[PDB]
């Protein structure tokens, strides 16, 4: 379980999480203020 | 050491002894083979023990007195879409600061036993509770059933635990039937009880 | 002892230690030599055991209602073939006390338990004795023999007492559950090819056995 | 890229349009499509099938440098 | 004595060593100093044999690898079924196939991108797909989502049942060496087993289900009204209304009265008129027979009974004046090294998917599927693809088995020795070939170029001038074509209508197919097929045949298989490994590749494709340019490119945007190649130095040090940027032009 | 069925195969050849 929890602390894990995260931020906040091109 | 196991004839994990209450060997993920990580777990079981009943209570109770002459509670799936003296918000608002302070000392409590036990406005006031998930003190056990023998409390904790885990997979069960059938919980147990044979899940997916 | 279609890798490792052992494994499924998972000499007697005695009741079960049908001490509503009862829907469906679906959770909650506890008895024979069951565990202890439990429960009426008796009775016991086995394969072939009871084909055949043959109906 | 620029701007100027560079050069497929890709059809038939004229040298030269450049690759 | 061997519990499950990034390696698990490690440990992941020398853990590793390989196509085929129930108009595509464009995939609305959802038809919105999964399902008699809903939930528990079996035949039950080695078993289970009663139960499902439910829609009866594919097994009637030879069962099957079955097996040939496809009688008869072929082929080798040959015998059989002991030691070679068998069956592989490729063409197995030009361009250049893929590999493993299992002490074999003592001769022949193939192809097209731009066309090689006939393939085309009348007797028709002689098929207005001309421009690319495939073949031949010594460097195959040179000594020896031949070769390979489906694509464009009027008249859809524009490299330039890149170019604002973009993408990507083609890592090395200079500067400096990639992964990174950017400019090329003019 | 000459012809194919010229895989694959060379015949007359 350590192990485990060690293996998602990983470069390529987390960077998938981190941006999975940003990526789903950056959608949702894009659909709310939709065609921003001032602010 | 001795207890009777969830599956007869497995080898508990090492990290399971059974001194805890509610011990029956069942870890097969090992989701809590690390100390730290099964005392949260411990605690995590036991407020959504106790939220699940007060929940399962709260939604069968009503509901079976509803469909009596008692009550006219409408459903529980649905009395959260309804209006109220104030905006459902506003509501949460107040629910997120209050319940964000007990959360609040309670975490601090989890994380360091001893410093949430006195009253920050009148020191005279402090909670009795020993062991971390149970206040105890004159709020949370004005009974004083909270303290007593080793033996008590490991029984009385496992009746608290397991009524527990009925309660949780009877929440669970409610939203799923409710999903389901469209109906009533109370509607489905007199469904079943009236025709056992045909009256079940298959009632609606074959 | 006698053999029936063996060969030296066959007679390498059969010795007539096991009962109906007629040195026939022209394939060499049972082989010693490098065992793992569910080919294993051990776990292939016991699943022999298993399936035989399972063939054993279903070749009953299979051909009962047909033949109790067919003479008259059952209702013709019950006088189904094995296939008709509900067990493949499309060929024929029967209204039980409750849905085949549910029927079928049923049966699997039942014989999960029935089936798991047999299956502790194998990984560790000194289990389903310890653990509470309502009193049961004490006739539940097993034998040291996986297939052969015995006991309160599973032989009430002792028998084998003697060892000449015993592997005579396992010898039998062996060999009607290969004939009975064969008579399922058979069930679901000549139910395959005909389109009727197998109590039909049987009467068909005695009737006119020229006529009525397999090299006749295609 | 300066090359570019300068010949299309100015391209875009003796023909009497402005509003070709000024709207397709703000992205990338305007220039591919409005500068590249219009600006070719004559130099390619120099020379075809159905006959040739005072533009084959500039074709042929054109393969010829598309040619030596692969080469160099 | 062939039997199941297997070790129990060879390596403990747990996650202990997913903690442990290069475990697998002595060297990548004692963590990084440089960042070069993180890139050692993904070159070094699946090289099983820089793990450990014990054959039987690496096989095991391969076998539990293959599971998870298998496991992942059953995802991607459950995702494709998936796609095509919940998220596709394929029943308003079953109603009208012929104006419906193929479409199973939609894209959600933010950013605009909702514009990808075009009409497609069917009162649906979505990107068209070309994979041609319609057809494949009409040919099946799929006709409800549903059926492709349990499709998809068979694939997903198929995909878990592998995966499975991947854990269980690694962790728990591991098979040994000699049960891997059992070729003979092997080869007769795969060949009766896999191929054999694949075929069989396949011919099954299609003269049970196929040829009714496919008879139904040909009818024209509305899906939702044809009966359930179960019926037709239930109901025996249903079969025998649509072929009455099922009145008679399988009795004329014992009794050998075949006679009676040719009813729906058939062997007419050519093409279904009312649906462009061949006929599904043929496929089920051709399944059977070849279900029969492989099933007694699978009897060949002897196992577990006396009967049956021995590989080693047959082999060690065949032994000549020219070539000595013949192929005595090649059974232990190709019962010892995975990397031989890895070549020879990437070799044949990749062959297999080329005629896959080819026969795909010009004989449509699929129903509606001749005339989704879009499909059939996309099958062809995709298997192409793939094909010269697996080729290349095919040499990078023969060269790694040169450098790694090669050892003429232990395991010699007489016909490799031979070839390596002439190696010489071969490579020079080669090379000559090469020059001469290059100059008497090109040099046509020069020739013409030039006689062209000095109006001077009455001198270039063409059909109206210097003419330069494929004689050979004309009269094996017409061979071909006047089969049935004599060497084919039972043949209605031809095998495919794109021999010399024949009628024409059309299906809804769109020419199916037709006969092919052959000219002038067809010996020309012919030609120049001839010659990239021997360039390709010259530089891997070299490429392995030297892989362990030359006159350079005699001791070579110690330096390994992958390494970047022997320094700038004796002149120079840069890519003088194996490795850098693979690596050269995969430019070759794209250049040839892409020059062939190029040929496909103006090829079946000018006399193939298009639509056709009343009364016969075909109007192609570049109108039979092809003879007088491909015979000049100027006609290829503005005829083929130029004019054909159209589509693509202005596909902004519509829904085939997406390949305009992915156009652009593909250019930027390739060029973008081209910085770690053509420089080298000492620059960026310093360069780096300068910035990890600020970064200290600044207290920013990380511990794992910021090094220039290796040469050899210069030159990976190259050719693969390279390769993905001018493969995806042709997709989206190819992609926007034929679903635009199609 | 009995009596024609497809019958007569496999069954003779299948008898001069088993008698060449003994386990249970011989039986079995001297049948199976015997069959073949049968259909071939009957079917190629
Ligand atoms: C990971 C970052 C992230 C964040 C911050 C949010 C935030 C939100 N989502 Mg969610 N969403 C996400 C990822 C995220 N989403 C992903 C990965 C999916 C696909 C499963 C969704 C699918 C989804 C649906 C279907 C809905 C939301 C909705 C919402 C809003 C609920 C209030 C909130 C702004 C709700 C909303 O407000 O929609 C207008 C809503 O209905 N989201
Ligand atoms: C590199 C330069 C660059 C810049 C400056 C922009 C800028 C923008 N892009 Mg563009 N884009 C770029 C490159 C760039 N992009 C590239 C390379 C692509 C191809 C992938 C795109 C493809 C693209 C699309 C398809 C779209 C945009 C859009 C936008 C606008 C989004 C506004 C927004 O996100 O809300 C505001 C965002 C925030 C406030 C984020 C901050 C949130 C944190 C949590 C605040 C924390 C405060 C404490 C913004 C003007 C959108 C648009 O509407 O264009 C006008 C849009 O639909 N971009
Ligand atoms: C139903 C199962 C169950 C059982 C066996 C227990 C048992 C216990 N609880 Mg727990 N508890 C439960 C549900 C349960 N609780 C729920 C649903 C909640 C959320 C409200 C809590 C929240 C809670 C707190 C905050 C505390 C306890 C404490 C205790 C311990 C002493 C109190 C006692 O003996 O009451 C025995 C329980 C019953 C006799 C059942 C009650 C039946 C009805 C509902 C009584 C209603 C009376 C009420 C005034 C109205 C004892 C181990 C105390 C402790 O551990 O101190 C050291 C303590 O401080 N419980
Ligand atoms: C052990 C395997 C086995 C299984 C799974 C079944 C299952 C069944 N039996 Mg059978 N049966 C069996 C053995 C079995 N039988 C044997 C060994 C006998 C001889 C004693 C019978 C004699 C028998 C009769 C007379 C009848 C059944 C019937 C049935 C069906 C209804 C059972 C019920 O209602 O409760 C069910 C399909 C009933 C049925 O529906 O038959 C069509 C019924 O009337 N069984
Ligand atoms: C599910 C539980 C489980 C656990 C805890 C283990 C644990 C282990 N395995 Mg085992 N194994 C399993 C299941 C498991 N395995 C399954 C399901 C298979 C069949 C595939 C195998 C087959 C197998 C082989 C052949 C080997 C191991 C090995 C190992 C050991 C080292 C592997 C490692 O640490 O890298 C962890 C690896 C990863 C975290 C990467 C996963 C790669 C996935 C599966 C490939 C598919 C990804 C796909 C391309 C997606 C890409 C998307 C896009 C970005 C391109 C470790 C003890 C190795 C060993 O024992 O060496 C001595 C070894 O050689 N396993
Ligand atoms: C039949 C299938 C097959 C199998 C099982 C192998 C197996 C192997 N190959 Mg071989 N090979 C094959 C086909 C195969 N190859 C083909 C088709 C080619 C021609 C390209 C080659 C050419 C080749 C070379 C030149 C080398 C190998 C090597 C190897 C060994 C190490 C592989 C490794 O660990 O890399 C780890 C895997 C990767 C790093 C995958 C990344 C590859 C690129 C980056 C992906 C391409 C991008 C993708 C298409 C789209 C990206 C989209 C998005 C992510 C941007 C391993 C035994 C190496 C070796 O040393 O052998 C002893 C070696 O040097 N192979
Ligand atoms: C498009 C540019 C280009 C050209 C013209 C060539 C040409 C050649 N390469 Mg290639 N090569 C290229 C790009 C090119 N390459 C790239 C980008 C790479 C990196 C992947 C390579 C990597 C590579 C490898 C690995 C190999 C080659 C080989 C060859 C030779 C093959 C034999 C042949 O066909 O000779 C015939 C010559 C031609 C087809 C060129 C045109 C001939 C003209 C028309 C004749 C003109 C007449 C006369 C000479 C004019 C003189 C006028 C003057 C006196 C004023 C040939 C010289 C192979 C080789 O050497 O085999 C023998 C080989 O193995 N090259
Ligand atoms: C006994 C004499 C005999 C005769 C007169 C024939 C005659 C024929 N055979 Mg047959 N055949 C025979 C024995 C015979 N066969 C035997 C012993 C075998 C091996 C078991 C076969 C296996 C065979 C195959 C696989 C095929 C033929 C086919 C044919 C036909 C075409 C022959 C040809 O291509 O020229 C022709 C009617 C071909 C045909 O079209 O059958 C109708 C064909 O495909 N034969
Ligand atoms: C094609 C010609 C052909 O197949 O020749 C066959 C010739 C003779 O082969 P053998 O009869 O010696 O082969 C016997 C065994 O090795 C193969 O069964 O092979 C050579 O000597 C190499 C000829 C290369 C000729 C240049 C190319
Ligand atoms: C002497 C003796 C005897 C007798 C014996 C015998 C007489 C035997 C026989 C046997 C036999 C007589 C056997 C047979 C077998 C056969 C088989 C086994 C067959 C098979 C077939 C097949 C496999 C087929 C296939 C196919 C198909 C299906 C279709 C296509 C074509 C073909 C043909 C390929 C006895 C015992 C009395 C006693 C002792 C002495
Ligand atoms: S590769 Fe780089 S280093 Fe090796 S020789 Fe060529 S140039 Fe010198």
Redesign the pocket.
């Known amino acids: 379980m350590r192990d485990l929890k060690t293996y998602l602390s990983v470069a390529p894990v987390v960077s998938t999480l981190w941006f999975?995260?940003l990526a789903?931020?950056l959608?949702?906040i894009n659909?709310?203020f939709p065609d921003a091109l001032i602010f | 050491p001795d207890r009777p196991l969830w599956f007869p004839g497995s080898t508990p994990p090492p990290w399971l002894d059974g001194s805890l209450p509610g011990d029956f060997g069942f870890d097969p993920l090992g989701l809590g083979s690390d100390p730290e990580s099964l005392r949260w777990n411990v605690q995590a079981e036991l407020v959504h023990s106790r939220w699940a009943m007060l929940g399962a209570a709260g939604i069968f109770i009503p509901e079976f007195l509803t469909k009596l002459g008692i009550l006219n509670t409408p459903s529980w799936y649905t009395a959260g879409e309804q209006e109220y003296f104030t905006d459902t918000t506003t509501l949460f608002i107040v629910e997120l600061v209050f319940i964000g302070w007990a959360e609040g000392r309670r975490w601090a409590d989890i994380l360091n036993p001893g410093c949430v036990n006195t009253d920050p406005i009148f020191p005279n006031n402090k909670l009795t509770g020993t062991d971390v998930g149970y206040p105890g003190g004159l709020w949370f056990d004005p009974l004083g059933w909270g303290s007593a023998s080793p033996q008590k409390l490991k029984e009385l904790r496992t009746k608290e635990i397991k009524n527990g885990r009925l309660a949780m997979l009877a929440v669970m069960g409610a939203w799923f039937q409710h999903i389901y059938t469209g109906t009533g919980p109370i509607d489905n147990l007199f469904a079943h009880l009236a025709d056992p044979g045909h009256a079940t899940i298959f009632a609606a997916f074959t | 002892r006698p053999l029936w279609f063996a060969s030296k890798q066959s007679l390498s490792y059969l010795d007539g230690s096991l009962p109906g052992d007629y040195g026939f494994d022209p394939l060499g499924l049972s082989d010693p030599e490098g065992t793992g998972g569910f080919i294993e000499p051990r776990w292939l007697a016991y699943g022999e055991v298993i399936n035989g005695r399972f063939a054993m009741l279903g070749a009953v079960g299979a051909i009962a209602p047909e033949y109790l049908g067919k003479v008259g001490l059952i209702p013709q509503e019950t006088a189904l073939a094995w296939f008709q009862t509900g067990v493949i829907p499309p060929a024929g469906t029967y209204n039980y006390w409750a849905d085949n679906y549910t029927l079928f959770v049923l049966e699997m909650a039942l014989m999960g338990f029935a089936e798991h506890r047999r299956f502790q008895d194998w990984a560790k024979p000194g289990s389903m004795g310890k653990q509470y069951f309502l009193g049961l565990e004490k006739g539940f202890g097993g034998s040291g023999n996986p297939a052969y439990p015995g006991g309160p429960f599973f032989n009430p009426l002792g028998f084998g007492k003697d060892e000449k008796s015993l592997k005579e009775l396992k010898l039998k016991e062996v060999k009607n559950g290969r004939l009975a086995m064969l008579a399922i394969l058979g069930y679901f072939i000549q139910g395959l090819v005909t389109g009727v009871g197998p109590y039909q084909n049987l009467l068909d055949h005695v009737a006119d056995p020229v006529n009525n043959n397999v090299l006749t109906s295609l | 890229w300066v090359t570019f620029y300068w010949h299309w701007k100015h391209i875009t100027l003796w023909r009497g349009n402005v509003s070709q560079f000024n709207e397709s050069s703000t992205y990338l497929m305007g220039w591919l499509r409005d500068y590249l890709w219009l600006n070719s059809s004559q130099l390619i038939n120099g020379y075809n099938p159905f006959g040739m004229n005072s533009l084959s040298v500039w074709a042929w030269m054109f393969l010829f440098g598309h040619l030596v450049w692969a080469t160099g690759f | 004595e062939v039997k199941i061997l297997v070790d129990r519990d060879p390596i403990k499950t747990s996650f202990e060593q997913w903690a442990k990034p290069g475990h697998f390696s002595r060297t990548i698990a004692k963590g990084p100093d440089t960042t070069t490690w993180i890139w050692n440990l993904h070159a070094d992941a699946h090289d099983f044999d820089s793990h450990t020398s014990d054959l039987e853990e690496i096989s095991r590793k391969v076998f539990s690898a293959h599971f998870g390989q298998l496991s992942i196509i059953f995802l991607w085929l459950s995702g494709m079924y998936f796609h095509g129930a919940r998220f596709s108009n394929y029943e308003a595509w079953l109603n009208d196939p012929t104006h419906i464009k193929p479409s199973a995939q939609v894209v959600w609305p933010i950013v605009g991108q909702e514009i990808l959802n075009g009409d497609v038809g069917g009162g649906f919105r979505g990107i068209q797909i070309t994979s041609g999964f319609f057809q494949i399902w009409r040919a099946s008699g799929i006709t409800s989502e549903l059926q492709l809903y349990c499709t998809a939930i068979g694939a997903l528990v198929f995909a878990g049942l592998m995966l499975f079996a991947g854990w269980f035949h690694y962790h728990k039950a591991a098979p040994k060496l000699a049960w891997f080695q059992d070729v003979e078993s092997m080869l007769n289970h795969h060949l009766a087993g896999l191929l054999g009663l694949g075929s069989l139960s396949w011919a099954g499902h299609q003269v049970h289900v196929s040829l009714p439910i496919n008879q139904f829609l040909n009818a024209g009866v509305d899906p939702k009204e044809i009966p359930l594919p179960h019926e037709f097994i239930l109901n025996r009637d249903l079969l025998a209304q649509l072929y009455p030879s099922f009145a008679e069962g399988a009795t004329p099957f014992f009794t050998l009265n075949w006679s009676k079955y040719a009813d729906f097996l058939t062997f007419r040939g050519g093409l279904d008129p009312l649906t462009g496809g061949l006929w599904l009688t043929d496929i089920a008869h051709h399944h059977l027979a070849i279900a029969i072929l492989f099933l007694i082929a699978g009897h060949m080798y002897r196992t577990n009974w006396g009967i049956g040959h021995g590989i080693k015998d047959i082999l060690e059989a065949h032994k000549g004046p020219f070539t000595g002991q013949g192929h005595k030691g090649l059974y232990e070679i190709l019962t010892t090294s995975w990397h031989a068998q890895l070549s020879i069956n990437l070799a044949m592989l990749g062959s297999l998917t080329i005629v896959v490729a080819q026969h795909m063409y010009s004989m449509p197995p699929y129903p509606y599927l001749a005339t989704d030009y879009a499909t059939q361009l996309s099958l062809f250049t995709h298997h192409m693809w793939i094909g010269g893929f697996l080729i290349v590999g095919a040499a990078a493993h023969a060269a790694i088995f040169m450098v790694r299992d090669y050892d003429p002490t232990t395991r010699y074999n007489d016909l490799l020795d031979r070839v390596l003592r002439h190696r010489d001769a071969i490579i020079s022949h080669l090379n000559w070939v090469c020059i001469f193939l290059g100059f008497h192809s090109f040099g046509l097209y020069i020739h013409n170029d030039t006689m062209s731009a000095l109006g001077r066309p009455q001198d270039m090689f063409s059909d109206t001038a210097i003419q330069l006939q494929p004689v050979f393939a004309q009269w094996i085309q017409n061979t071909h074509a006047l089969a049935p009348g004599t060497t084919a007797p039972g043949a209605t028709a031809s095998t495919s209508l794109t021999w010399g002689g024949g009628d024409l098929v059309a299906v809804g207005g769109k020419v199916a197919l037709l006969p092919i001309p052959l000219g002038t421009a067809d010996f020309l690319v012919h030609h120049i097929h001839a010659f990239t495939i021997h360039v390709t073949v010259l530089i891997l031949l070299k490429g392995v045949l030297f892989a362990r010594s030359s006159r350079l460097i005699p001791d070579k195959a110690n330096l390994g298989f992958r390494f970047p040179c022997d320094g700038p000594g004796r002149g120079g020896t840069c890519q003088v490994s194996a490795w850098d031949h693979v690596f050269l070769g995969l430019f070759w390979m794209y250049n040839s590749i892409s020059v062939v489906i190029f040929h496909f694509s103006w090829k079946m464009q000018s006399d193939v494709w298009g639509t056709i009027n009343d009364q016969g008249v075909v109007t192609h859809i570049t109108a039979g340019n092809f003879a007088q524009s491909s015979i000049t490299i100027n006609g290829w330039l503005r005829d083929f490119l130029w004019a054909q890149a159209s589509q693509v170019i202005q596909s902004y604002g519509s829904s085939l945007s997406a390949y305009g973009l992915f156009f652009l993408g593909a250019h930027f990507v390739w060029a973008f190649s081209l910085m770690f083609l053509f420089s080298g890592r000492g620059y960026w090395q310093e360069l780096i130095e300068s910035i990890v200079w600020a970064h200290n500067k600044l207290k920013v400096a990380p511990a794992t040090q910021p090094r220039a990639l290796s040469i050899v992964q210069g030159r990976a990174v190259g050719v693969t940027h390279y390769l993905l950017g001018g493969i995806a400019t042709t997709w989206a090329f190819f992609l926007a032009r034929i679903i635009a003019v199609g | 069925f009995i009596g024609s000459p497809t019958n007569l012809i496999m069954v003779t194919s299948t008898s001069l195969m088993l008698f060449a010229g003994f386990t249970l895989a011989d039986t079995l694959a001297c049948g199976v050849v015997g069959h073949i060379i049968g259909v071939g015949v009957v079917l190629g007359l």
Do not use: N, Q, V
Request: charge should be neutral; glycine fraction near 24%; hydrophobic fraction near 50%.
């Open positions: 999975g995260a789903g931020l959608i949702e659909r709310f």
